[PDB]
Design an enzyme around this catalytic site. Structure first.
Site, short mmCIF file in Angstrom:
data_model
loop_
_atom_site.label_atom_id
_atom_site.label_comp_id
_atom_site.label_asym_id
_atom_site.label_seq_id
_atom_site.Cartn_x
_atom_site.Cartn_y
_atom_site.Cartn_z
N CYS B 105 0.84 -1.20 0.00
CA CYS B 105 0.00 0.00 0.00
C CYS B 105 0.88 1.25 0.00
O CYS B 105 1.63 1.50 0.95
CB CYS B 105 -0.94 0.00 1.21
SG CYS B 105 -2.16 1.37 1.28
N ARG B 108 -0.07 4.65 2.86
CA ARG B 108 -0.03 4.43 4.30
C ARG B 108 0.32 5.68 5.10
O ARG B 108 0.23 5.64 6.33
CB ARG B 108 0.97 3.31 4.63
CG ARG B 108 0.44 1.89 4.37
CD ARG B 108 1.51 0.81 4.67
NE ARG B 108 2.49 0.67 3.58
CZ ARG B 108 3.67 0.06 3.72
NH1 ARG B 108 4.00 -0.47 4.89
NH2 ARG B 108 4.51 -0.03 2.68
N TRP B 277 -9.30 5.88 -1.02
CA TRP B 277 -9.61 6.55 -2.27
C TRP B 277 -8.57 6.13 -3.31
O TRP B 277 -7.50 5.63 -2.97
CB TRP B 277 -9.63 8.09 -2.14
CG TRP B 277 -8.44 8.71 -1.46
CD1 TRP B 277 -7.22 8.98 -2.02
CD2 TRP B 277 -8.37 9.17 -0.10
NE1 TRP B 277 -6.39 9.56 -1.09
CE2 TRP B 277 -7.07 9.68 0.10
CE3 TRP B 277 -9.27 9.17 0.97
CZ2 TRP B 277 -6.66 10.21 1.33
CZ3 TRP B 277 -8.86 9.69 2.18
CH2 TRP B 277 -7.56 10.20 2.36
N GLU B 282 -4.18 3.56 -10.84
CA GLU B 282 -4.99 2.35 -10.71
C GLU B 282 -6.08 2.30 -11.77
O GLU B 282 -6.29 1.26 -12.41
CB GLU B 282 -5.63 2.25 -9.33
CG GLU B 282 -4.69 2.25 -8.16
CD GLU B 282 -5.45 2.08 -6.86
OE1 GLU B 282 -5.87 0.94 -6.58
OE2 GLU B 282 -5.64 3.08 -6.13
C1 HEM Z 1 -6.51 6.35 1.81
C2 HEM Z 1 -6.04 6.26 0.56
C3 HEM Z 1 -5.38 4.98 -0.02
C4 HEM Z 1 -4.65 4.96 -1.15
C5 HEM Z 1 -4.35 6.19 -2.03
C6 HEM Z 1 -4.19 3.60 -1.38
C7 HEM Z 1 -3.42 3.17 -2.44
C8 HEM Z 1 -3.13 1.84 -2.72
C9 HEM Z 1 -2.65 1.28 -3.97
C10 HEM Z 1 -2.37 2.08 -5.26
C11 HEM Z 1 -2.50 -0.04 -3.82
C12 HEM Z 1 -2.02 -1.04 -4.89
C13 HEM Z 1 -3.14 -2.05 -5.15
C14 HEM Z 1 -3.18 -2.40 -6.61
O1 HEM Z 1 -2.27 -1.96 -7.36
O2 HEM Z 1 -4.13 -3.10 -7.03
C15 HEM Z 1 -2.88 -0.38 -2.46
C16 HEM Z 1 -2.87 -1.64 -1.89
C17 HEM Z 1 -3.33 -2.01 -0.65
N1 HEM Z 1 -3.86 -1.17 0.30
FE1 HEM Z 1 -4.01 0.87 0.11
N2 HEM Z 1 -4.68 2.81 -0.36
C18 HEM Z 1 -5.42 3.61 0.50
C19 HEM Z 1 -6.07 3.17 1.63
C20 HEM Z 1 -6.00 1.91 2.20
C21 HEM Z 1 -6.77 1.46 3.34
C22 HEM Z 1 -7.82 2.34 4.06
C23 HEM Z 1 -6.43 0.18 3.60
C24 HEM Z 1 -6.95 -0.76 4.72
C25 HEM Z 1 -7.46 -0.31 5.87
C26 HEM Z 1 -5.41 -0.20 2.64
C27 HEM Z 1 -4.78 -1.42 2.56
C28 HEM Z 1 -4.21 -1.92 1.40
C29 HEM Z 1 -3.87 -3.30 1.11
C30 HEM Z 1 -4.07 -4.51 2.04
C31 HEM Z 1 -3.34 -3.35 -0.11
C32 HEM Z 1 -2.85 -4.62 -0.83
C33 HEM Z 1 -3.88 -4.89 -1.91
C34 HEM Z 1 -3.60 -6.21 -2.56
O3 HEM Z 1 -2.49 -6.76 -2.34
O4 HEM Z 1 -4.48 -6.70 -3.29
N3 HEM Z 1 -5.17 0.88 1.80
N4 HEM Z 1 -3.25 0.79 -1.83
C1 LIG Z 2 -8.32 0.28 -0.17
C2 LIG Z 2 -7.74 0.51 -1.53
C3 LIG Z 2 -7.45 1.80 -1.94
C4 LIG Z 2 -6.91 2.01 -3.20
N1 LIG Z 2 -6.62 3.26 -3.64
N2 LIG Z 2 -6.68 0.96 -4.01
C5 LIG Z 2 -6.95 -0.31 -3.65
C6 LIG Z 2 -6.63 -1.39 -4.68
C7 LIG Z 2 -6.87 -2.83 -4.26
C8 LIG Z 2 -6.67 -3.79 -5.43
C9 LIG Z 2 -5.75 -4.83 -5.31
C10 LIG Z 2 -5.54 -5.71 -6.37
C11 LIG Z 2 -4.54 -6.83 -6.24
C12 LIG Z 2 -5.13 -8.18 -6.61
N3 LIG Z 2 -4.67 -8.64 -7.93
C13 LIG Z 2 -3.30 -8.19 -8.21
C14 LIG Z 2 -4.71 -10.11 -7.95
C15 LIG Z 2 -6.25 -5.56 -7.55
C16 LIG Z 2 -7.17 -4.53 -7.68
F1 LIG Z 2 -7.85 -4.39 -8.83
C17 LIG Z 2 -7.38 -3.64 -6.63
F2 LIG Z 2 -8.28 -2.65 -6.78
C18 LIG Z 2 -7.48 -0.57 -2.39
CL LIG Z 3 -9.29 -0.93 -8.65
#
Ligand code: HEM
Ligand SMILES: Cc1cc(N)nc(CCc2cc(CCN(C)C)cc(F)c2F)c1
Ligand SMILES: [Cl-]
Ligand code: HEM
Ligand SMILES: Cc1cc(N)nc(CCc2cc(CCN(C)C)cc(F)c2F)c1
Ligand SMILES: C[C@H](O)[C@H](O)[C@H]1CNc2nc(N)[nH]c(=O)c2N1
Ligand SMILES: C[C@H](O)[C@H](O)[C@H]1CNc2nc(N)[nH]c(=O)c2N1
Ligand SMILES: [Cl-]
Ligand SMILES: [Gd]
Ligand SMILES: [Gd]
Ligand SMILES: [Gd]
Ligand SMILES: [Zn+2]
Lengths: 401, 401
Positions: B105, B108, B277, B282
């Site tokens: 993430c 964070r 958000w 993405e």
């Molecule tokens: C507040 C604004 C936030 C932004 C801008 C953000 C941004 C991102 C992005 C760009 C990813 C990459 C996921 C992907 O490429 O598909 C990610 C992954 C992730 N985020 Fe955040 N996030 C936010 C909030 C949160 C919150 C609120 C949580 C949990 C309480 C969180 C937990 C995670 C987790 C667990 C992943 C791993 C997703 C995965 O492996 O599938 N994030 N985040």
């Molecule tokens: C809370 C939150 C905020 C934010 N800004 N973005 C996210 C993205 C999570 C997300 C993870 C994955 C990994 C799974 N895939 C590689 C097998 C794919 C997605 F399409 C996706 F949307 C979550």
């Molecule tokens: Cl998405």
């Protein structure tokens, strides 16, 4: 054996070649350090034995009389002298394998097309210089670049190493400035100071080609100027932004890495410069746009009349794309070989497929293979990869100073 | 024994002493790195003890009355019931910690601002749906997005799980054809076929918001139509390319991952949807331009009249940049929270700095932190990172079938 998925197509393979990885990397089950840039006769014998086995497999003579004769010859020579000498054909095959095995190289579809110059008889820094000039001339080939390596004498007991102090054969000077800035290439401040310290009369431009500092065994390094007509350069212009030419930017044709160690069957060659041709992002993105390099991104975006006061205009992205266009256009205009990041990554995908059939896998470093712009627009982004160390190999080594 | 971590843009060095606490061993070995792979009874007391210690240290209350008291009750609870219940404050603290610990993430910097809805007394897919509906309307907040998580009941022996069958709360349908290929989102073809199979009347469109499949313990799923006025969406237009709107593209406001498992103090919550958000790449890069997603890149380049005949025009890079521009412009015009990849990565560098001081390091997955366009134009590209597993955590889990 690790399962490896491609996410664009759905393909799945298993990297069985990784199980043969001899030397160890930096990761553990506790922590992955994949993103870090910089991570005895019986043991020489076992490395040599493995390489001879590799050579005789490549020539469809595994287990033959000549194979066992060579294994026996090597042990006897190590017993008699503490080391051994490669046959000429073994050296050529080992240089090619070292390229093939290099996990950070996206250009490895070419690995079998490599001109190997045998300079293992080199006697002095003066002869070394002549060998290097011939390498540059052959590899540059008036802009139709040809992959090559020149192999200088191996490390051996009783004598110091041959070394090239420069990190590449062609590099631009970097001059620490009046106000503490740098004029020229900041990556080259150290080698520039060493050349000056060793009698070079510096310039004061942004694109001054450095002299070579060449070290013969047990000798201080010796300074050699490259004849300017040996160093092919490309002035940078942009096909539609005519003011881009007024930036006065240039880059050189030949990327020739000269500070790595070539290791073949336990033997080590500390001086063995190799060269291919550029992928355009190396120049357009890293060398010209890294904040700690030429750092031209904001100046280009201002000239483009982009709104640089807000990140969400994507002014940085727009200016970097046009700098990469300028590089490609200028090298093509000059008839100097170059490959863009889309063509290069597509050919790397073919390499992975070729290697899966040939050896059951391919060592690759995802963070180095994926280009520094437009990462997920290239097919390698969606390809899982397995990183490990095979020998023969190109290794980093410490600076000789 | 403490990994050295260098930033190559600035030259600064740190040591990750926090890495020396990783529980769940990762996928790498000294022999090979698998960092680029997407997917790699009283031991409950061990993880509960450690988590309670985490709690009381974070409130500067280790080694005092309330801390010792809480240790015994979980001991007695597990002795009397085989599990334990989290205090409200602990559930809050653990939710924020799992976020803080997520190596992939980039957002964070926000980990301290998290709204935690406690749905642990839920029972039935009907209660789920109203819980999910409260979250969505709270998190969306008319476009001023607020990070939020809802924690459904923990897993216990002898009884089925709460599960959301959808991967996100808002997903677009993917429909096959008289020829295999997909209209809509190809990533959701499977849940689309489940929803239709469970009684949902499909649409014809490329952006049909799917229904929810919510699963109370030991019962088959139940379809739920999301209230249309509760799913906030953004039609996509471009600031200067007037035809971009006519492409009919849209994306939804709220990214709410609903298929991951939250683990706190040895307790498992297979239903704990979290939302923040969007970072604009993405949507603009991955969702719209991946070859296996909406794959719109060439359609946009045709409309821009780019030369798609040669890769070295960088027509792919140019069209991709404008798609990202359209996402940012559209969300801002709609007053829906979004952050661009430059702003986001700069905030992450600040988070790394904070975490260095607060905890002595930060688990980060380089390949996921670096954005999928313009990688080396962001500071995280030049930052070395260490990846490891800390608890509490968000974990992947099998599809509920
Ligand atoms: C507040 C604004 C936030 C932004 C801008 C953000 C941004 C991102 C992005 C760009 C990813 C990459 C996921 C992907 O490429 O598909 C990610 C992954 C992730 N985020 Fe955040 N996030 C936010 C909030 C949160 C919150 C609120 C949580 C949990 C309480 C969180 C937990 C995670 C987790 C667990 C992943 C791993 C997703 C995965 O492996 O599938 N994030 N985040
Ligand atoms: C809370 C939150 C905020 C934010 N800004 N973005 C996210 C993205 C999570 C997300 C993870 C994955 C990994 C799974 N895939 C590689 C097998 C794919 C997605 F399409 C996706 F949307 C979550
Ligand atoms: Cl998405
Ligand atoms: C023929 C065209 C070639 C292309 C297009 C190409 C492409 C590249 C690129 C883009 C990199 C990353 C370098 C960086 O980011 O600084 C690289 C690394 C590397 N290449 Fe190739 N290369 C070519 C030829 C060769 C040859 C001929 C050799 C050796 C015989 C070789 C061996 C290596 C090695 C060892 C590395 C890693 C260097 C390091 O880690 O610093 N390459 N290559
Ligand atoms: C043969 C060849 C072909 C090609 N197309 N490109 C190259 C560039 C290799 C290269 C690698 C690095 C990594 C430095 N890092 C280890 C600290 C730095 C350099 F200055 C450099 F030139 C070489
Ligand atoms: C810190 C990070 O590992 C470093 O910036 C790497 C990432 N990937 C790279 N990839 C290539 N091709 N060349 C590089 O110099 C780097 N640098
Ligand atoms: C194969 C590779 O690991 C895979 O494509 C990863 C790379 N980095 C990523 N980074 C983010 N943020 N999201 C992703 O889905 C991926 N995919
Ligand atoms: Cl270079
Ligand atoms: Gd013009
Ligand atoms: Gd100027
Ligand atoms: Gd037109
Ligand atoms: Zn690793």
């Amino acid at each position: 054996f690790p399962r490896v998925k491609n996410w664009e197509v759905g393909s799945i393979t298993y990297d069985t070649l990784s199980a043969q990885a001899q030397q160890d990397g930096p990761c553990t089950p506790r922590r992955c350090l994949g993103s870090l840039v910089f991570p005895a006769p019986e043991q020489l014998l076992s490395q040599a034995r493995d390489f001879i086995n590799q050579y005789y497999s490549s020539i469809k003579r595994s287990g033959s009389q000549a194979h066992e004769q060579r294994l026996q010859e090597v042990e006897a020579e190590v017993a008699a002298t503490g080391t051994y000498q490669l046959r000429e054909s073994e050296l050529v095959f080992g240089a090619k394998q070292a390229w093939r095995n290099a996990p950070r190289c996206v250009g490895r579809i070419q690995w079998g097309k490599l001109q190997v110059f045998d300079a293992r008889d080199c006697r002095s820094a003066q002869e070394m210089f002549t060998y290097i000039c011939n390498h540059i001339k052959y590899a540059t080939n008036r802009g139709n670049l040809r992959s090559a390596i020149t192999v200088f004498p191996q490390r051996c007991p009783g004598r110091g190493d041959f070394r090239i102090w420069n990190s590449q054969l062609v590099r631009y000077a970097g001059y620490r400035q009046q106000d503490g800035s740098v004029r020229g290439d900041p990556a080259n401040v150290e080698i520039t100071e060493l050349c000056i310290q060793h009698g070079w009369t510096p310039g004061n431009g942004r694109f001054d080609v450095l002299p070579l500092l060449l070290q013969a065994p047990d000798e201080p390094p010796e300074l050699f100027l490259l004849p300017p007509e040996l160093v092919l350069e490309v002035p940078l212009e942009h096909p539609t932004l005519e003011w881009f030419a007024a930036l006065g930017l240039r880059w050189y044709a030949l990327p020739a890495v000269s500070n790595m160690l070539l290791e073949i069957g336990g033997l080590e060659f500390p001086a063995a410069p190799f060269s291919g041709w550029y992928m355009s992002t190396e120049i357009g993105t890293r060398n010209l746009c890294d904040p700690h390099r030429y750092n031209i991104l904001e100046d280009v975006a201002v000239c483009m009349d982009l709104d640089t006061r807000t990140t969400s205009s994507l002014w940085k992205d727009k200016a970097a794309v046009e700098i990469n266009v300028a590089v490609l256009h200028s090298y093509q205009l000059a008839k100097v070989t170059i490959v863009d990041h889309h063509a290069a990554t597509a050919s790397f995908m073919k390499h992975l497929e070729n290697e899966q059939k040939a050896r059951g896998g391919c060592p690759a470093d995802w963070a180095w293979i994926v280009p520094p712009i437009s990462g997920s627009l290239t097919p390698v982004f969606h390809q899982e990869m397995v990183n490990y160390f095979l020998s023969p190999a190109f290794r980093y080594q410490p600076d000789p100073w």
